[PDB]
Symmetry: D2
Subunit: 455 residues, 4 copies
């Protein structure tokens, strides 16, 4: 069920291994907010899968061959031809990471008052849409909003909803469909090739553009190879190329599936949009020949994207995350299902039914995990949702979760056991977990710097 | 007069060394546009002094210690302490380079219709001011606009013009003063400490904020050290710290004086503005704990800013540029005077007085320079100025220049001799340089991809 | 029982992942000799634990700070201070690896006809002793020669045999005692502190010198910590320092316990011997200030020896090897016992009891293991023993083994499972493993290039 | 006359720039022996051209791709095929540096009592010859021993002398001719292709083997291209390959002309000698598949040897050393002539005619140079010659020199001016240089650690 790592360890990152009593002190110094912990004090850091990937020896060799010319860099040429080959789009503009590409796309592709419809949303992606005057419309299938429902390709768009938006608003009033692979907010859920095809077919008929939010497109391609009938003789590369054939362009974060610590890019087929993109990138990112990246980083990202196409690599990536989910589920620990490509989400509401949402069960569970194991996880619940600035009440999200987000190629199954075993042990005495109260609350971005104490 | 390099060569960048006939074919394939040349075909690349710097062994050691954590990275803390120590500001927000810091500043500090006044301007800096509703006012001393005038501290603000603006417009209507060090548009001209102090004193009396465009603040500190009475017993670090003591914050490009290939940051003293800056950075750049940079780049920038404080390093940096300018001037080659900190600008109007501006003397001179020496330079004249959209006429700039822009720690005096001797030989038969005409002209950003042929 | 890796993965070594049929073709191209396989064709390479270690980010930072000066390098001074601090010797002479230190020691310390007595022996170590006129005497306890006997500190010297040698030969006729930690030939067996102390006390009483063959001294320190009464409150560093307090000097391979890919050194207390060692090092290795090493490697070895002192690192190192041995033993696979610090040795005589030694059971078993798993192992049996030049008969060794040798910080428990599960499956049908016969036999060093076919 | 560096600076090595009064203190703390100075206290280190070369970006990329397998490393394969291509020998055995290859060759190729004849000698090379029972015979042309004589190809063998050795001793009593390129002891003097051919022709007729001491064979190839008629249309590679076609094998130090900081190798054509070489390398260096080098170093050396074949690189290398010599000679400073490929040697006897050899003019001149400029040079005179252990008198060498030895790709012409200008300034008041006396003298290797004071 679970393959060994399809690589060896070339170099290691040293860790302190501080014991429980010392971790409790660090957690207190951090006001029980994992976002305030110091990296040097953490054994296993599952705060994010963004930008913390372990690069290969070949990428590090590329890092030594940075050609830092303002224009005409060999590294820009390599990235451009690699993305043209693997994603199949005509034009590429580098950006420093994914949200830089989102800024450009939304300024280029939206008229004020138009709709952008997508399969759920991501914070930066949707901000740039709305900042530019779009109204967001969620067209994901209804099941994706049910966190416990175990169905395949849970990230699929509901074609009926797309049809109704077209019927009610008119095609000329829809800027574009923003189709994300995988779907982050539903827990990293994949989208089927059948769905990408059907969405292309209906939008094309109406003259409507489609742009992917493509940050975990390789994880997605793996779910298609594993679970979609007809794809068993296809390579990961073949699946990735067909996926993008159903789009007019994409925004990409190299920090996720391109196996790098920084980097992103915007792709499109249209020449006029490319010309406009080049004049705007200069303002926000840099020249079209580097887009806010060192030459060595264009090189690392070109090499990493190609490494991601290796079947054994992405199979192990997804099955390692699956192992953690399987082990938690086998012990009765409540999690979002099915497990996604990049993370396991604990259902903190169910984990701590002895607590009210106003006692911050997700924030507290995350604190408990670090103290007991040296593992950092992210609060994705009531705290991150923020306070209603009109009423003064918490926004109360339906999802009250702790995200165990897994960087690529950094951890082993033994690290996964450290994580699972500690959570399972906490779950056996789940009632002992204490509620939290604010002792310091910022007006904005409160998850980042808020401090708490036990009730 | 001209010191030796205060460092040894640790590693080299290999070059092809292709001869004149082969360079002529490359120039023709690039349509006589140096922006279109491949980096792999160039011996000495003086297109820019941005982000092409040679890092040290110590910076490379730091590159291997990237702590890629989303929050709490050791590299963030090191950058933050370093900038607090050396610049003297309370708060720091990393950005991927300088224009990312400008975007944040202009959104936070400007109400539509307010004025932003500075000592001349830079393209991205003024764009971000104008995009947010500011009206730009030039308050540099009149002398700065006379490219032939040899005077010290030519970058100084005219206190009388600053004063007139306040009287005629009202303090409440001025968003801030944007004081740049050095002043790029005048050829890299320094600003005196006496000027920085007088501006602080006047603005403070009216409650007006001052923010520095600080990209070449260390080169600026060197000029003060060399030429301003009273600064002979002061270190570069003491001068830099006093400079920033007369500001409310700054936008910085590490890609210039911090000796790195990517990186920048925003500094401010005000607690409220810091909180707002953290909200905005997340949508354009990244979390406040990395700001669109890999941990290793925060580390390389922290180390490089400290290396920039070494007296012998910056003396050599500035005197290398001076060597090139002195050698050209002694042969009668027309240049912008006095030579600034980072570049030498050739007056192509005067160099090719036999051509009209319509025949693109700067574009043609930069082409000749590549063919004859393997040196790439930047057109900064009528081509880069663009065409008037409304009328369809060229914008005809007063400055018709070729910029010989010098990366830090990359080249030797022998390389400077290749550059100078080739230009001097061309000058001796300047009448023979041919005019250019468009064969392909983009509607936007024409300097980046336009192609030409000889008349 | 089995701790998780006390480090994260910083970078990876990419592997091909070729399937069984393709591995069989590679094995055939290598003439069924694992020594002849290409590294690029191997998934898990257990040929050696020498010089294949994964370095840390901190060691890689040191690799960028190589001070390549012929004398007075900062890296030399750092190595020298570190070894003085941790090993407690007065003088240090770097060598390119351990056998370079052995060459110097044996030339300096042996008069022709004198005896060198030790706890078993290693090939290079004993060669250098014999080449200089020493007669080797084995003074290990008899139990060490019983490969099946499970006892602690199996590497211990028999004080009664040491005593007999002194009585029968005379102290003046003993050049030195060569005490090895751990003892490689018995499978990596540790020596107790009590034994080291008793040997020092006896030799000192007769004026006999003791020099340690120290290549796996840290693994040895771990066993003492785990199993010798009285050492529970002692650090690894305290144990290492006390170990070397009972010697006059040592030969060390950094390629083993100092966590590097190249490097070694010679230590001694005696001023006169140090002066002589400096004269000799210049002709074989290099100046005493670098000893056949790049400055960056002196740095990486100084850093790596200090990292080896971390309790969690060495506990994990030794327990990973133990995991592999435990899993094999539980399935009934015959191995040398108890499992040592660095490797597991399969008893191929017992594994392939259906074959005669003349049919090369160890060579054949190592071939099968590669075909079935992509794991490379070393023949340490009749092939490596060589042929008798005088008679032309095989040397027929008591030990007919396949060595599963484990590089430090390179592999995971999942990799250990690939190794074990493949061997266990082979064991279940052991009768089917075929004998080998030579098709090409070199006159010298036959194990390195001999080729075979199945009988 | 003097080409610019045919490369750019990729990274730099930071230096302290300590002033004169501080340098005087360091020199005193070092007992006026430059060999005792710390690297961190030196601005320009010309102690040696061995192993201090600046590697390229491509070599550093290779450094990240180290394949550290005990056998079958991709890096060993690359080195082997590179040396086979460029030097043209059948077999290669890596060694950690040149003197490791010398140890093997001399043990394999000499019977006790035989002669080895060569064009002068090098210390390690000759030691290994004699240790194995050879009698050394100098067969260089008589002119090479006249240090002031300006003739081309001053390193040539005197064919008449070779003939007389053959006539008087008999061919069967000559182990081999050891032909060195360039000839170090005469100041780095080249050998002509005509001479290498004639030596091959005479030895072949008598059945006598020829092995090169090849450490600066690329410098040598450059002198042939520049000065030997018939070689002007030949590439450096073509000249190098023909050179080696006149030999039976070679010993090579990568630390000189292969542009690396560590590494060497032994080459031969004979199969039986190759087999014997492989059994002996194991004892002293390591397996024939790595020979005492990390895989990354076999890779760097393979890449560096190929870089050395670039005409512009080796032309600049030799002409940079020539510039220093020309500038010194133009000021009347006495030097060994003609200037060689890798160093300038000052004639300290003539520089300080006011001193006797017993007052150590070379040791003192070297001290003066460091104090006045921050430049380290090596004593190659009476001190290095050592004391006669029978008589107690100094060995009094004819040559009393200070070696300014130039690492490859590390320094600029401005560093050369620092060196020359300081020596010239010292030369104008040459009479002020004070004699030295021993205050501490070791019995052996006295140049390395002896301490002095002014008379
Ligand atoms: K990162
Ligand atoms: K750059
Ligand atoms: K190795
Ligand atoms: K070296």
């Amino acid at each position: 069920n679970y393959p060994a790592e399809p690589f060896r360890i070339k170099s290691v990152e040293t860790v302190s291994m501080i014991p429980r009593d010392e971790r409790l002190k660090k957690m207190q110094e951090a006001g029980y907010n994992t976002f305030l912990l110091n990296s040097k004090d953490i054994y296993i850091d599952l705060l994010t899968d963004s930008g913390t990937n372990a690069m290969s020896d070949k990428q590090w060799a590329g890092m030594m061959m940075g050609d830092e010319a303002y224009a005409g860099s060999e590294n820009f040429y390599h990235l451009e031809r690699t993305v043209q080959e693997l994603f199949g789009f005509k034009h590429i503009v580098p950006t420093h990471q994914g949200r830089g590409a989102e800024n450009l796309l939304s300024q280029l592709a939206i008229k004020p008052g138009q709709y952008v419809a997508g399969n759920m949303y991501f914070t930066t992606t949707r901000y740039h849409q709305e900042k530019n005057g779009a109204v967001f419309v969620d067209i994901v299938r209804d099941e994706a909003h049910d966190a416990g429902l175990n169905i395949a390709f849970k990230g699929d768009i509901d074609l009926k909803k797309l049809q109704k938006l077209i019927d009610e608003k008119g095609a000329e009033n829809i800027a574009y469909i923003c189709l994300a692979v995988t779907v982050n907010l539903a827990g990293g859920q994949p989208v089927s090739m059948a769905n990408m095809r059907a969405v292309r077919e209906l939008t094309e008929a109406h003259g409507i553009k489609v742009f992917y939010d493509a940050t975990r497109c390789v994880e997605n391609a793996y779910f298609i190879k594993e679970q979609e009938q007809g794809f068993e003789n296809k390579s990961i590369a073949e699946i990735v190329h067909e996926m993008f054939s159903y789009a007019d362009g994409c925004t990409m974060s190299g920090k996720k599936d391109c196996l790098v610590n920084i980097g992103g890019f915007l792709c499109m087929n249209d020449d006029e949009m490319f010309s406009s993109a080049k004049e705007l990138v200069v303002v926000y990112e840099g020249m079209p020949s580097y887009g806010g990246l060192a030459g060595r980083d264009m090189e690392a990202m070109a090499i990493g994207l190609r490494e991601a196409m290796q079947y054994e690599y992405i199979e192990h990536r997804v099955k390692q995350v699956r192992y953690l989910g399987d082990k938690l589920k086998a012990a009765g620990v409540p999690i979002v299902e099915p497990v996604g490509g990049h993370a396991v989400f604990l259902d903190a509401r169910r984990f701590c039914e002895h607590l009210t949402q106003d006692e911050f069960p997700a924030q507290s569970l995350a604190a408990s995990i670090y103290v007991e194991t040296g593992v950092r996880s992210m609060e994705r619940g009531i705290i991150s949702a923020g306070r209603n600035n009109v009423t003064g009440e918490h926004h109360r999200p339906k999802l009250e979760t702790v995200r165990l987000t897994i960087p690529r190629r950094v951890y082993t199954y033994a690290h996964m056991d450290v994580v699972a075993d500690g959570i399972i042990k906490l779950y056996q005495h789940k009632e002992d977990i204490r509620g939290l109260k604010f002792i310091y609350e910022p007006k904005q971005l409160r998850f980042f710097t808020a401090r708490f104490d036990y009730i």
